[PDB]
Design an enzyme around this catalytic site. Structure first.
Site, short mmCIF file in Angstrom:
data_model
loop_
_atom_site.label_atom_id
_atom_site.label_comp_id
_atom_site.label_asym_id
_atom_site.label_seq_id
_atom_site.Cartn_x
_atom_site.Cartn_y
_atom_site.Cartn_z
N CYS A 186 30.32 55.36 58.92
CA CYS A 186 31.75 55.03 58.85
C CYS A 186 32.46 55.49 60.11
O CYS A 186 32.44 56.68 60.45
CB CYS A 186 32.37 55.67 57.59
SG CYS A 186 34.12 55.39 57.36
N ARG B 47 31.78 45.37 56.87
CA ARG B 47 30.41 45.28 56.38
C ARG B 47 30.25 45.78 54.95
O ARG B 47 29.13 45.84 54.42
CB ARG B 47 29.48 46.05 57.32
CG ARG B 47 29.38 45.38 58.69
CD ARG B 47 28.84 46.33 59.73
NE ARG B 47 29.66 47.54 59.87
CZ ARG B 47 29.43 48.47 60.80
NH1 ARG B 47 28.43 48.31 61.66
NH2 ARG B 47 30.20 49.55 60.87
N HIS C 269 30.70 54.72 52.90
CA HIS C 269 29.46 54.16 53.46
C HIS C 269 28.95 54.99 54.63
O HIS C 269 29.72 55.68 55.30
CB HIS C 269 29.65 52.71 53.91
CG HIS C 269 30.68 52.54 54.99
ND1 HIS C 269 30.35 52.36 56.32
CD2 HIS C 269 32.03 52.56 54.94
CE1 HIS C 269 31.45 52.27 57.04
NE2 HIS C 269 32.48 52.38 56.22
N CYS D 53 36.05 51.54 51.83
CA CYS D 53 36.49 51.45 53.21
C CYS D 53 36.76 49.99 53.59
O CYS D 53 36.16 49.07 53.06
CB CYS D 53 35.45 52.07 54.15
SG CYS D 53 35.97 52.11 55.89
N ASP E 72 35.97 48.72 56.38
CA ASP E 72 34.83 48.27 57.19
C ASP E 72 34.34 46.91 56.71
O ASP E 72 34.03 46.72 55.54
CB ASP E 72 33.68 49.30 57.15
CG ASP E 72 32.54 48.97 58.14
OD1 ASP E 72 32.23 49.81 59.03
OD2 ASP E 72 31.94 47.88 58.04
ZN ZN Z 1 34.26 53.07 57.05
#
Ligand code: ZN
Length: 209
Positions: free
Chosen positions: A99, A44, A96, A40, A42
């Site tokens: 999400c 993080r 993750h 992803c 994302d």
């Molecule tokens: Zn995500």
């Protein structure tokens, strides 16, 4: 202020050069990653850091909610280049917990273009609506759907003719599904690894070319 990034970069490159002045020169001569990471976007969930890899080690694709579609030449071209040209040995499908893409798929707000992107996850929430209904909190439903999504995406990757043809010609290649915990930094195996044609349902197996 971009200046910090530029200054950060100079400091990082120079620091590396003093420990190993040839580091980048050697790396630049050939690309030989053993892994493809599909994960992803994302912020993080940065791949190299999470599994302790260096530049050169991980071919990377990242998109919202690590979605793999058989009509998407964006993701499929990364897979095909990784499998056919770089000959990576492993594809790491890593989702993750928490999400936002997955979470959006469970709610009914329109986010615009991304609504279409997240369709296959919304489909999954529908398919598993009975299972997800028996979970008491929204966070549990999201986190379980995050797992279900990774498992589906592992299937989607393994079903590609890219992967099956690699197998038909005797190339060693495994597709793994993992999930990262943004709350604890832990990268966990979901244990759904696919390494050969015999593990595919008959309805999805393609004959060799
Ligand atoms: Zn995500």
């Amino acid at each position: 202020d971009l200046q910090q990034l530029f200054e950060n970069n100079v400091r990082w490159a120079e620091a590396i050069k003093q420990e190993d002045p040839d580091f980048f020169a050697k790396l630049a001569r050939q690309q030989t990653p053993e892994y493809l990471w599909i994960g992803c976007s994302d912020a993080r969930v940065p791949a190299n850091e999470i599994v302790g890899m260096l530049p050169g080690d991980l071919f990377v694709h990242r998109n919202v909610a690590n979605v793999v579609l058989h009509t998407d030449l964006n993701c499929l071209s990364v897979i095909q280049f990784a499998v056919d040209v770089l000959k990576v040995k492993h594809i790491l499908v890593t989702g993750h917990y928490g999400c936002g893409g997955v979470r959006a798929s469970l709610h009914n707000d329109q986010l615009g273009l991304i609504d279409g992107w997240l369709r296959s996850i919304r489909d999954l929430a529908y398919e598993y609506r009975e299972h997800l209904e028996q979970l008491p909190t929204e966070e549990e439903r999201v986190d379980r759907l995050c797992e279900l999504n990774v498992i589906q995406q592992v299937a989607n990757v393994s079903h590609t003719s890219i992967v099956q043809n690699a197998w038909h010609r005797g190339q060693s290649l495994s597709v793994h599904g993992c999930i990262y915990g943004i709350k604890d930094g832990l990268w966990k195996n979901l244990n759904v690894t696919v390494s050969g044609l015999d593990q595919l349902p008959p309805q999805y197996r393609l004959s060799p070319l």
